[PDB]
Amino acid sequence: ATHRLLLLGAGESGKSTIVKQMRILHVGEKATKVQDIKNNLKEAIETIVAAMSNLVPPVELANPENQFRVDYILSVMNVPDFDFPPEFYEHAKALWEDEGVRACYERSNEYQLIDCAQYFLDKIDVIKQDDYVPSDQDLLRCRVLTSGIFETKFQVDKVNFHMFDVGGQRDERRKWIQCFNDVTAIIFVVASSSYNMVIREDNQTNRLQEALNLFKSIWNNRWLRTISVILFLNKQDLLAEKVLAGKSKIEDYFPEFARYTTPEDATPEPGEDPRVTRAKYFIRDEFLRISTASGDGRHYCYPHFTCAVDTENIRRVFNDCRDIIQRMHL
Amino acid sequence: MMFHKIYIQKHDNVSILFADIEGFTSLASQCTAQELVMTLNELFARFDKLAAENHCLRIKILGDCYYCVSGLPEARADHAHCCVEMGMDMIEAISLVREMTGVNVNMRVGIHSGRVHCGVLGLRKWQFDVWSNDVTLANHMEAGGKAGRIHITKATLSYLNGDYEVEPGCGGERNAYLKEHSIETFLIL
Amino acid sequence: HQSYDCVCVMFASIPDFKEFYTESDVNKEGLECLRLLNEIIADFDDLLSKPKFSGVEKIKTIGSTYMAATGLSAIRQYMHIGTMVEFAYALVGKLDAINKHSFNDFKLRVGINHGPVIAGVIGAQKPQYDIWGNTVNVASRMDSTGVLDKIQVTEETSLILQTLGYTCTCRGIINVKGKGDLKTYFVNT
Numbered sequence: 163a164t165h166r167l168l169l170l171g172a173g174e175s176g177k178s179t180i181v182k183q184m185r186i187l188h189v190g191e192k193a194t195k196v197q198d199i200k201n202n203l204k205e206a207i208e209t210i211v212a213a214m215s216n217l218v219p220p221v222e223l224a225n226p227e228n229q230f231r232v233d234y235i236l237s238v239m240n241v242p243d244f245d246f247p248p249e250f251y252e253h254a255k256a257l258w259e260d261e262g263v264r265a266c267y268e269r270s271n272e273y274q275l276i277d278c279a280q281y282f283l284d285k286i287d288v289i290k291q292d293d294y295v296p297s298d299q300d301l302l303r304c305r306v307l308t309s310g311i312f313e314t315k316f317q318v319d320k321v322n323f324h325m326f327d328v329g330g331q332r333d334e335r336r337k338w339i340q341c342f343n344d345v346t347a348i349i350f351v352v353a354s355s356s357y358n359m360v361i362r363e364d365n366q367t368n369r370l371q372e373a374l375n376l377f378k379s380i381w382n383n384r385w386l387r388t389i390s391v392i393l394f395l396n397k398q399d400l401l402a403e404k405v406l407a408g409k410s411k412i413e414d415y416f417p418e419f420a421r422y423t424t425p426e427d428a429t430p431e432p433g434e435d436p437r438v439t440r441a442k443y444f445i446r447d448e449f450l451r452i453s454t455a456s457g458d459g460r461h462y463c464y465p466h467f468t469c470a471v472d473t474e475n476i477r478r479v480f481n482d483c484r485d486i487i488q489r490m491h492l
Numbered sequence: 493m494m495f496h497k498i499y500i501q502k503h504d505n506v507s508i509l510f511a512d513i514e515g516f517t518s519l520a521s522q523c524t525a526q527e528l529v530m531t532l533n534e535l536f537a538r539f540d541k542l543a544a545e546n547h548c549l550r551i552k553i554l555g556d557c558y559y560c561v562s563g564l565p566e567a568r569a570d571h572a573h574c575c576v577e578m579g580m581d582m583i584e585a586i587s588l589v590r591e592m593t594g595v596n597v598n599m600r601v602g603i604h605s606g607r608v609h610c611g612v613l614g615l616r617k618w619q620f621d622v623w624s625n626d627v628t629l630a631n632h633m634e635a636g637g638k639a640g641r642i643h644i645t646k647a648t649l650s651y652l653n654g655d656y657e658v659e660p661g662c663g664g665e666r667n668a669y670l671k672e673h674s675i676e677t678f679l680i681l
Numbered sequence: 682h683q684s685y686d687c688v689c690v691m692f693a694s695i696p697d698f699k700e701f702y703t704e705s706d707v708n709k710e711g712l713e714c715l716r717l718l719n720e721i722i723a724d725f726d727d728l729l730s731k732p733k734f735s736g737v738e739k740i741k742t743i744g745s746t747y748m749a750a751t752g753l754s755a756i757r758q759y760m761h762i763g764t765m766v767e768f769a770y771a772l773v774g775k776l777d778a779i780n781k782h783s784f785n786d787f788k789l790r791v792g793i794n795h796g797p798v799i800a801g802v803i804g805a806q807k808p809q810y811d812i813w814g815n816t817v818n819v820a821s822r823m824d825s826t827g828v829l830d831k832i833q834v835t836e837e838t839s840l841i842l843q844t845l846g847y848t849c850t851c852r853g854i855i856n857v858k859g860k861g862d863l864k865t866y867f868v869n870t
């Protein structure tokens with residue numbers, strides 16, 4: 163039997179990261195992906211420095227010396243084919259070391275900054291080696307936007323899976339429709355953590371709210387009245403951290419969180435902070451209200467608290483899915 | 493259940509022939525609106541004959557444009573020569589009803605070979621049609637064609653076993669699409 | 682076949698579709714596109730079965746373009762004219778519905794014009810219904826040169842519409858092949 167799974171979700175929600183996990187789990191090339199990793203590293207640093215002067219209030223370096231490195235990073239910012247000379251890494255790390263720069267990083271929600279920033283910046287010395295080999299984790303972090311539709315094929319216990327990946331950004335959504343017929347199930351991806359961020363498309367639409375409205379669009383779609391949705395509440399790790407950091411409150415972006423108390427059937431993780439539990443579930447329910455209101459038992463919604471970059475958490479919930487595919491005779 | 497049953501079906505290895513009237517407006521600036529519709533009907537009546545002979549399938553008629561396709565209903569390896577011959581017979585066909593018109597009526601044959609997706613769209617007033625890039629391209633041969641000749645693509649020449657004789661149509665310079673798509677056109681001699 | 686003195690012809694196309702058509706292995710070769718079109722058309726056809734559009738006659742569909750006519754159901758006086766217009770708005774209201782569910786942004790282009798037309802059938806093998814005349818391509822050209830979400834109508838057409846309680850803006854001039862330069866107007870909503 164073959165089950166064609168479609169991956170839908172906003173931008174950077176983590177769609178490509180799951181398809182990656184599928185090759186990790188059920189399926190010399192790493193050479194070409196080193197470049198893309200470095201490209202990430204570059205964007206990460208150059209973006210944070212850029213934001214320093216534009217944030218309000220602006221952000222001052224803790225070491226005036228670094229200004230020159232700041233001037234450096236900017237000068238090579240739009241360079242076409244960058245050589246990634248040895249100095250670059252030095253100037254890069256230097257800045258990262260700079261406390262003021264990190265202060266700016268903490269306010270990265272106030273500007274568009276790729277996820278893998280901190281991760282990669284923290285291994286400049288590793289990535290700079292010319293004998294450098296990307297770990298599976300690094301590849302999981304390597305962010306590269308997807309434009310168009312990509313189909314991946316795998317097999318699990320001789321059960322065939324045809325997974326479809328697409329672009330999450332608004333301009334891409336117009337290609338989705340080409341996979342709405344004969345689809346088996348929809349795996350809707352959500353970037354739980356991005357409750358304090360806005361999308362790139364206008365830098366004004368809240369990212370979480372964008373996911374909601376988008377989910378609503380798929381749920382209540384005139385051609386998905388029967389299709390059940392496997393809702394992945396991803397980037398749990400980022401969410402938890404954010405919640406525990408206490409810096410930016412959820413009730414400030416979604417005031418309805420103030421009225422919220424945690425559910426009964428709530429099953430927390432071993433030693434999971436009640437605030438984290440209370441939050442991730444608040445988030446989940448927001449998506450359930452959307453599915454509950456309509457559908458008429460024609461199709462169903464299956465939540466999942468996930469972390470795509472985590473091959474273990476993913477091997478876990480994916481099985482939770484293989485079941486529902488079989489168990490529901492889908 | 494989700495989408496209306498689509499009465500569509502793919503079809504590989506076929507030949508798509510388009511044909512329009514060289515300067516139809518000049519033609520209409522002379523004869524009565526009725527006489528045109530009659531000359532038209534007259535022609536295509538003769539056309540539909542040649543079609544069923546040349547193993548073709550008339551698809552639809554849009555004023556002065558006639559487009560049938562060999563390779564249907566049933567697949568035929570001879571699908572290319574059919575359209576060609578069809579073009580041939582069409583060439584003379586139009587030439588003979590030019591006698592009745594007493595005016596410069598002429599055609600412009602364009603044929604590209606490939607694959608289509610045919611059926612019918614919507615729910616009401618069904619009309620058989622064909623759909624594909626090759627089908628768009630065939631249409632552009634008819635456009636970037638040459639009056640009185642047969643404008644075949646390099647694909648239509650490869651299913652032809654070159655039993656016919658071609659020559660640079662240079663259609664790339666006679667039509668934007670053919671140029672923008674690096675298309676080597678020819679013309680049956 | 683007979684002729685008429687006043688039929689309101691309308692052409693409505695979706696330019697944005699030709700680009701949208703993609704023949705990739707993923708979408709089964711533009712099939713899924715044709716499937717999305719089949720819906721669009723099917724949707725427009727559903728309008729015909731209404732109470733106020735009970736006088737509209739879908740004639741045929743060419744490419745992504747919808748071709749209907751009003752006033753053929755006859756041997757205040759030009760109500761079918763404003764009706765053909767009301768049908769344009771219908772098509773659009775229906776097109777912006779699809780977009781909502783296809784995460785797309787399709788836009789219709791309209792061309793409405795009237796005048797005598799020669800109705801009847803052409804094609805000998807399987808005959809098909811179609812209307813002819815200058816009245817026709819003029820409305821056609823009103824579309825091929827119209828603007829997105831705008832109905833381009835000839836001046837005669839304009840005049841009446843106003844008497845019918847419509848406002849119109851003079852687009853300016855247009856070179857209608859064979860008919861020289863004409864002065865079109867846009868139906869302001």
Ligand SMILES: CNc1ccccc1C(=O)O[C@H]1[C@@H](O)[C@H](n2cnc3c(=O)[nH]c(N)nc32)O[C@@H]1COP(=O)(O)OP(=O)(O)OP(=O)(O)O
Pocket residue numbers: 512513514515516517518520524525526528529553554555556743811812813814815817818819821
């Ligand atoms: C004064 N004109 C006419 C009087 C009686 C019958 C027809 C006409 C007439 O010239 O109609 C045109 C369309 O309505 C009509 N036509 C096109 N498609 C359709 C169609 O789908 N249905 C009907 N009924 N008519 C159509 O055929 C004609 C072709 O228009 P094109 O813009 O395609 O010009 P061309 O084919 O490229 O020739 P040209 O002068 O460069 O060389």
Ligand SMILES: Nc1nc2c(ncn2[C@@H]2O[C@H](COP(=O)(O)OP(=O)(O)OP(O)(O)=S)[C@@H](O)[C@H]2O)c(=O)[nH]1
Pocket residue numbers: 171172173174175176177178179180276277278302303304305306307308328329330331351396397398399400468469470471472
């Ligand atoms: N911290 C953390 N990062 C994650 C998680 N899931 C994915 N990411 C990171 O998110 C970034 C974007 O992931 P990606 O899979 O490209 O998003 P996408 O939905 O595919 O978005 P697009 O590429 O169509 S615009 C990557 O750097 C990836 O490593 C998670 O659970 N936690």
Ligand SMILES: C=C[C@@]1(C)CC(=O)[C@]2(O)[C@@]3(C)[C@@H](O)CCC(C)(C)[C@@H]3[C@H](O)[C@H](OC(C)=O)[C@@]2(C)O1
Pocket residue numbers: 621622623624625627628629631694698699702743744745746
């Ligand atoms: C529907 C999609 C697409 C791309 C596919 C195609 O092969 C066409 O339908 C043909 C060429 C093709 O079906 C033969 C008829 C005709 C009338 C010549 C069509 C139009 O030119 C269409 O353009 C329009 C107006 O959509 C076009 C080009 O559109």
Ligand SMILES: [Cl-]
Pocket residue numbers: 171172173174175351352353354356369370373
């Ligand atoms: Cl998201």
Ligand SMILES: [Mg+2]
Pocket residue numbers: 177178306307308309327328329330
């Ligand atoms: Mg992607």
Ligand SMILES: [Mn+2]
Pocket residue numbers: 512513514515516556
């Ligand atoms: Mn012509």
Ligand SMILES: [Mn+2]
Pocket residue numbers: 512513554555556557
């Ligand atoms: Mn024509």
